Design a protein around this ligand. Structure first.
Ligand SMILES: *C(=O)CSCCNC(=O)CCNC(=O)[C@H](O)C(C)(C)COP(=O)(O)OP(=O)(O)OC[C@H]1O[C@@H](n2cnc3c(N)ncnc32)[C@H](O)[C@@H]1OP(=O)(O)O
Lengths: 174, 4
């Protein structure tokens, strides 16, 4: 049984370790401090309550996101406006390798979409994914995110540029 | 994955 809870500061070291092991983009300490303290970043952790060795509270998946103003986002021209509209930008999403292919990422995205639906001013959820990340791309397409843009040379990794795709899930009639 |  996988359970879900907000990220808290006891997750800090685990969160940092997973990120540097599964994302080629490197993040600074202040990002993780911001995630675990709550504040302006919203996040969900996935935990396996049955793990032994006292790791039954260690997260095995996560999603982090922030609320942005729609009018000041890169997809402002795509949205239909109605309070000031906002968007939820998914910052990072990942599942530990031995826990993949069980629907945990789908459940985490659903938690983000459910959250965003509950905000009347919210116009959708969007994210960037690196080109050729086929497991993630298939997931977003499976959950009805639309690819609206290919950003040439978006990511800088070890001195080389890689494309990203911008995926959007439109909400509340936007 | 948000950029750097
Ligand atoms: C910026 O961060 C946003 S883009 C970066 C995304 N993260 C990333 O690349 C990090 C490394 N990758 C992962 O962490 C992981 O591969 C994800 C996050 C991309 C997906 O995680 P899951 O593995 O948890 O995803 P699921 O929701 O499990 O769906 C994946 C595939 O498996 C099939 N599936 C789902 N439940 C199943 C069960 N119970 N039994 C069998 N198969 C199951 C889904 O249908 C889907 O289909 P594929 O055709 O992709 O296999």
């Amino acid at each position: 049984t996988i359970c879900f809870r907000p990220i808290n500061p006891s997750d800090l070291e685990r969160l940092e370790q997973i990120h540097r092991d599964i994302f080629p983009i490197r993040y600074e300490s202040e990002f993780f401090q911001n995630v675990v303290n709550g504040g302006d970043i919203v996040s969900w952790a996935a935990v396996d309550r049955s793990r032994p060795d006292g790791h039954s509270e260690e997260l095995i998946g996560f999603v982090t996101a922030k609320i942005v103003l729609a009018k000041e986002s890169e997809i402002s021209d795509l949205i239909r406006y109605d309070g000031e509209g906002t968007l939820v930008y998914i910052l990072t999403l990942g599942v530990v390798e031995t826990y993949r292919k069980r629907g945990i990422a789908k459940a985490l995205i659903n938690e983000v979409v459910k959250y965003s639906s509950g905000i009347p001013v919210c116009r959708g959820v969007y994210l960037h994914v690196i080109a050729h990340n086929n497991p993630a791309i298939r997931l977003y397409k499976r959950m009805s995110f639309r690819c609206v843009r290919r950003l040439h040379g978006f990511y800088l990794i070890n001195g080389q540029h890689f494309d990203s795709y911008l995926f959007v899930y439109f909400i509340n009639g936007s | 994955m948000v950029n750097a």
